[PDB]
Amino acid sequence: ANVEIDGKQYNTFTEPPKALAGERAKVKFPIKDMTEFLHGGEENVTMIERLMTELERDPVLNVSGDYDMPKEQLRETAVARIAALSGHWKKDTEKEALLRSQLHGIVDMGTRIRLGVHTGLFMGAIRGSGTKEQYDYWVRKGAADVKGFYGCFAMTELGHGSNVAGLETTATYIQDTDEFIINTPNTGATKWWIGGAAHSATHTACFARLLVDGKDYGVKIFVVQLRDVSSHSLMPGIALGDIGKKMGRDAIDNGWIQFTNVRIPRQNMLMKYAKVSSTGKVSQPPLAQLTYGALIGGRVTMIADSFFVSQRFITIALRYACVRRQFGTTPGQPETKIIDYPYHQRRLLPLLAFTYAMKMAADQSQIQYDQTTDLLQTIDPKDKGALGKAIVDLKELFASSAGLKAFTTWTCANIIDQCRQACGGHGYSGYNGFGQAYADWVVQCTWEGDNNVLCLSMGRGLIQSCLGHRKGKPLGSSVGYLANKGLEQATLSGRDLKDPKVLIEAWEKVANGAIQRATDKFVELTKGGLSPDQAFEELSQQRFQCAKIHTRKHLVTAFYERINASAKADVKPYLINLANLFTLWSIEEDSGLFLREGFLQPKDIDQVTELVNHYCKEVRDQVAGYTDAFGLSDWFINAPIGNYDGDVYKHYFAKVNQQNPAQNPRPPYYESTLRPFLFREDEDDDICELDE
Amino acid sequence: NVEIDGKQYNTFTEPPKALAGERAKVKFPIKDMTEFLHGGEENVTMIERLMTELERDPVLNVSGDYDMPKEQLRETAVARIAALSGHWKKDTEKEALLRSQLHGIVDMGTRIRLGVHTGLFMGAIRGSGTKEQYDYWVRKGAADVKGFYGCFAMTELGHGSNVAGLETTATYIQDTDEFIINTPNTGATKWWIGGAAHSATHTACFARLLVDGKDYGVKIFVVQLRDVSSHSLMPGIALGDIGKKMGRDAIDNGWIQFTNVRIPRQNMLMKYAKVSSTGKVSQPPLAQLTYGALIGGRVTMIADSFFVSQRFITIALRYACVRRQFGTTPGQPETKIIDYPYHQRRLLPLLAFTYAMKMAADQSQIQYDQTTDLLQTIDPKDKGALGKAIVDLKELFASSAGLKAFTTWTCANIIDQCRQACGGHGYSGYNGFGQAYADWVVQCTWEGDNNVLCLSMGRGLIQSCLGHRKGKPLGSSVGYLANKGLEQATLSGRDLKDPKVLIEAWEKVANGAIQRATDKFVELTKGGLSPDQAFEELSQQRFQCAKIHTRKHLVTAFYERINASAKADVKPYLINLANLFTLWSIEEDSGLFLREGFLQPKDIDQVTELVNHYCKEVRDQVAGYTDAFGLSDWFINAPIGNYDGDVYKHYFAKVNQQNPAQNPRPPYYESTLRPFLFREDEDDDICELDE
Ligand SMILES: Cc1cc2nc3c(=O)[nH]c(=O)nc-3n(C[C@H](O)[C@H](O)[C@H](O)COP(=O)(O)OP(=O)(O)OC[C@H]3O[C@@H](n4cnc5c(N)ncnc54)[C@H](O)[C@@H]3O)c2cc1C
Ligand SMILES: Cc1cc2nc3c(=O)[nH]c(=O)nc-3n(C[C@H](O)[C@H](O)[C@H](O)COP(=O)(O)OP(=O)(O)OC[C@H]3O[C@@H](n4cnc5c(N)ncnc54)[C@H](O)[C@@H]3O)c2cc1C
């Protein structure tokens, strides 16, 4: 059958652009103001618009044909891509450069990192850990401009990743020559996963145990030249190779490295923090402005990346959903668009809410970090209690960072995966991006701190924060709710579940509950004679749960706080609608936490279910506005079913035929392989003669 | 550095010795655990024989597959079909399926490319052809793939799940005794048709049967796509390669359009629906269309989930036994990650789930064979005994659906989790995770979209609830719905290590969800909503019903198969697994059991302590549970997963073999890298202007 809209008849092929226009027609807010909320104002929006257009327009950058590229071409084109991006280094501010590389990561996660290993990790190490004179030297050798020089970052070993303190590569001081000997003692200590090392890097920042006169001073950082710059040949004692095929991100040339008795000058050790004299005396000064703006910054960047990737796929799935019809139960009626189904709304709309929430947690973290850094600077008289609070605010920021990184990276993975399923078998088309994006994304969970290892540390960290509070230490701003003793007795008490203040309190309750009980058990177990370490091991599930509940509560809090703080009036009700869906959905997913603490009873879960259904419908009405608010052009979407105009089948059929021209019906292997098989001769079924 | 048996090992040298240590702890004969997993000694030797015939065959060697581009995968799949074809003359139906599933532990692309002819096309002409039609197509080369290659065109760009809504039309023309097959719009383009782009000469085309302006619904028609001699497209046929997929690139999925294609009437497959030479349409009742194929298919998928899951769980666990990261005692070596309680939690319940998927597969097959016989036996029928066989059947379909959905999603999850359990090394293509996950996941979308199956199931469970309420009979699978005691049952201080108590907890929670959503449905229908609008209003509830019932089914099936088939030497160790599975399952969905009031908050702490305990008991025997799968290094196909445990040495070797390192510079060094590193400086000059 056929659909009639505005006096005209449509078919399965022609209806989609009309359906999606119909959705746009419902939008009650101006989209520009929703885009200002996501990116923190007008100035930021124009900047992002500028950067996005610069990327998309660049001919060498074009991602349109990347799905069909084998690894050798990904490897080659990433270099050409680097040469093009290299034009902006002269011009860009740090903020511009970071944001340009994150925007570009929406569609090319390989090139960004292949540059990134020099641009951030190697340059980060020489700037972060070298003296001014050491930095300036490497820059004169061409390291800032990537001129006859290309760095990489060699920390990970085949045997050690998470436990950096346990690296086995050694750097042995020899006084006679004033040198370090860099040595890989067994093949287990071979450097591993080193981006750029396989084919690109002339130098590395090598992490090795510092050994002077039989004393082990722990892991430090040494510049080791990997290749003769002139010929790209390996320096003496340097072995390295391409690690080969990865799940994803094949454009990056991750290599292994072995060092055998490689001689470097003492001066190649980076010495801002740890210093070694020409006589072999080792010093490690107090160095108070050690403040790891960088550590928080690295995590805030990844929390934002989770946003930047998620918005693409959630946009693809939702636009598809607005036009895709499957099934109906009316004789006279067309099949229902899947967006109209309440189950499908539950699959996608919370994740749309989740993606907005990811950005607010990145923004809230960067802002809390900025006010806390600014607060330290103002207080010269050093009112000590005040400084102590500013320090624990900063400490708890770093700690909260670990959970946010862990969960927003996992969540981004789940969204890519879910959005793919939501588009059915057309999810499995390489051109709709799900496959490649998922494969590329997933490493974010492993590198920059294993997600599970971060969650267990932060879970231990919360128990230590709670126990130190009980002993009279002040709590950092991020875990202040642990001091709130109104939560012991708190219950819903017939309050409104549509009120953000209530839903906030409910996440404070279950976080506090889990952490106080875990801290109590840790105390029973230590008194019982376990060491601190053995007690934390006994409480591995509880530490993980604490990390999880606290992070969830932080996402909820940051969403509401940022709405209250920065949302213009015309968008505010639609954001609260999003926020309530996020928050009530989250409650619904983890109903047990709420039952067990006694905040809700069996009947209140039913009500929560009804509210999630309700906000699903409120969010669904405005869905085109929420998704168009991301401001992604079709180039960033990079999937036919997700294009702005909504002509899902026309573009998809176009994309397939463009990349797969159909004029020849037989495969390249038809004569060689397929034809010989289909036309094979019959078996010889004679049997040998034998008398009798 | 570590000392074992008075000898020195390092990070590189230890791992083979560590894994041998774990084998030393095993308290059962591993061969009996294999017998349990595969239903006894005979099946096991058949499996062994098959696996070895696959491993040996040089054409099928999968060692270099990860590095292979799409063009290679496509060609290679055909060479592999040629080699696998050597077994068609001799295999039984049992051996052929099994050989094909075993093969798909390592090559998800080839079995499907063969499969579309082998299973889908042949299945349609056998299933829906008359004997004469079948024999005709066999005579033209179909059975033997001689001058003939089939595919299955059902899906259209417009329709996947809603098969009844397909738009492609078959119009009968008496004058010429022909159907006209036609694709009315581009939306109706057949899509995802494996074999079509490059391989297939013929398709089983699903189209609406139109006779005299009467639409008789979707039927099946054989349509020649290509001239056999030249492989060129036939008049009115347009097809093309769909191109890059997330996975399974070896399969040549195509799109197809039909433009007034004429086929003889006799090409319509006429076992159930017949059209005469005058346009007389007949559809006799005909025994209900034999859905053992439909159930049979879901059972296969459940097993496939076991067959893949075992591989990745084995790789991850063997890795976990040798990998040391972090230590707490200043003097000692770093702790092997398998000794971390949180690592145990991530993997050993998945290992348990792996076994459980098999049990549910085996259970389903048995129940379905058993019900099928108790239909033949009842040639003479007594009103009550024919009715419950029918109702046990219906409840088998529903149970099949949830099982397929959740076991396939679980297998995806297992793959993903095992990859993260191996850290960075999980992201190497050579350790299998990336490609397996990319290939596997489509199982969640085809053969019934997993979400659509769940929402059907949960509607079905509600309807069975309403049925019983109104005096209708209950299928065995949903019997717990008739249990009076359940409504007020509580833990009441009973042992959580007792399987029976755990069964009751799961029965209570499933029944609780179903009955409650039934009351909601009745109340909403009373309110005046139509049956279908109320289900839609209850969509959360239908899903939740399906998940809960399916989880419960997995639990009971595990215990039931252990009690039915576990010898004494392995029983305690399988109850340990089963218990871990069931208690971990309770911990993961604690809110359900709090909400029905079976458990109190105090009981949730005890479940957590028991998950911790059963993790320890299962950890001790890990080598036994994983070796029992009986996979050789060829099936593992991952360096860190190898039998000997020499994880670093195999891994460094695999990498270097595939990536010879003798040349330091990339193939683009002169063309691309070298001109960038040594590019000339910017021109800083500024145009002259007096002013
Ligand atoms: C594509 C890619 C590129 C990379 N590029 C670089 C690079 O350029 N430079 C570089 O230096 N590194 C690089 N790495 C390495 C990466 O930083 C590490 O892989 C990661 O930080 C740690 O992983 P691992 O392999 O050390 O695993 P491990 O730390 O050994 O952990 C392995 C598994 O064991 C578990 N585990 C570990 N410790 C514990 C514990 N105490 N308790 C419980 N469970 C535990 C973890 O959860 C994990 O699942 C790269 C990795 C990848 C995948
Ligand atoms: C690799 C591959 C190979 C294939 N090979 C073949 C082949 O050889 N032959 C062949 O005939 N077909 C083939 N297919 C097609 C495949 O069977 C379909 O993709 C699948 O069966 C149906 O999904 P769909 O794309 O039609 O999505 P739809 O049915 O539209 O579903 C899309 C999304 O909408 C949601 N949705 C749909 N209906 C509802 C509802 N009522 N309520 C709630 N949510 C709903 C679904 O959950 C799904 O997430 C292949 C597919 C793939 C991926």
Curated annotation (Swiss-Prot), chain A:
Q: In which pathway does it act?
A: Lipid metabolism; peroxisomal fatty acid beta-oxidation
Q: What top-tier enzyme class does this entry carry? A: oxidoreductase
Catalytic activity reported: a 2,3-saturated acyl-CoA + O2 = a (2E)-enoyl-CoA + H2O2
Q: Which InterPro entries match?
A: ACOX_C_alpha1, Acyl-CoA_ox_N, Acyl-CoA_Oxase/DH_mid-dom, Acyl-CoA_Oxase/DH_mid-dom_sf, Acyl-CoA_oxidase, Acyl-CoA_oxidase_C, AcylCo_DH-like_C, AcylCoA_DH/ox_N_sf
Q: Which organism is it from?
A: Yarrowia lipolytica (strain CLIB 122 / E 150)
Recount how this protein's activity depends on pH. Answer: Optimum pH is 7.4.
Q: Name one GO biological process term.
A: fatty acid beta-oxidation using acyl-CoA oxidase
What job does the chain carry out?
Oxidizes aliphatic acyl-CoA substrates of different chain lengths such as hexanoyl-CoA, decanoyl-CoA and myristoyl-CoA as well as aromatic/heterocyclic ring-substituted chromogenic substrates, such as furylpropionyl-CoA. Of the above substrates, the efficiency of the enzyme, exhibits the following order: decanoyl-CoA > myristoyl-CoA > hexanoyl-CoA > furyl-propionyl-CoA.
Task: Report whether Glycoprotein shows up as a keyword of the record.
Answer: no
GO CC annotation: peroxisome
- UniProt name for this protein: Acyl-coenzyme A oxidase 3
Q: Which domain of life is it from?
A: Eukaryota
Entry note: thermal dependence? Optimum temperature is 23-38 degrees Celsius.
Q: Which Pfam families match?
A: ACOX, ACOX_C_alpha1, Acyl-CoA_dh_M, Acyl-CoA_ox_N
From Swiss-Prot, chain B:
Its EC number(s): 1.3.3.6
Instruction: Spell out the subcellular localization from the entry.
Output: Peroxisome
Reaction equations catalysed: a 2,3-saturated acyl-CoA + O2 = a (2E)-enoyl-CoA + H2O2
What pH behaviour does activity show? Answer: Optimum pH is 7.4.
Q: Which GO terms describe its cellular component?
A: peroxisome
Which GO-annotated molecular functions does the record name? Answer: acyl-CoA oxidase activity; FAD binding; fatty acid binding; flavin adenine dinucleotide binding
Which residues lie in coiled coils?
A: none
Name the SUPFAM superfamilies for this protein.
Acyl-CoA dehydrogenase C-terminal domain-like (SSF47203), Acyl-CoA dehydrogenase NM domain-like (SSF56645)
Major location (coarse): other
Q: Which InterPro entries match?
A: ACOX_C_alpha1, Acyl-CoA_ox_N, Acyl-CoA_Oxase/DH_mid-dom, Acyl-CoA_Oxase/DH_mid-dom_sf, Acyl-CoA_oxidase, Acyl-CoA_oxidase_C, AcylCo_DH-like_C, AcylCoA_DH/ox_N_sf
Its keywords, alphabetically, are: FAD, Fatty acid metabolism, Flavoprotein, Lipid metabolism, Oxidoreductase, Peroxisome
List this protein's GO terms for biological process: fatty acid beta-oxidation using acyl-CoA oxidase
The pathway this protein participates in, as annotated, is: Lipid metabolism; peroxisomal fatty acid beta-oxidation
Query: What are the required cofactors?
Result: FAD
Temperature behavior of the protein's activity: Optimum temperature is 23-38 degrees Celsius.
Q: How does it assemble?
A: Heteropentamer composed of five different subunits.
Summary of the function given for this chain in its UniProt record: Oxidizes aliphatic acyl-CoA substrates of different chain lengths such as hexanoyl-CoA, decanoyl-CoA and myristoyl-CoA as well as aromatic/heterocyclic ring-substituted chromogenic substrates, such as furylpropionyl-CoA. Of the above substrates, the efficiency of the enzyme, exhibits the following order: decanoyl-CoA > myristoyl-CoA > hexanoyl-CoA > furyl-propionyl-CoA.
- Into which family does the record put it? Belongs to the acyl-CoA oxidase family.
Q: What is this protein called?
A: Acyl-coenzyme A oxidase 3
Origin organism is Yarrowia lipolytica (strain CLIB 122 / E 150) (Yeast)
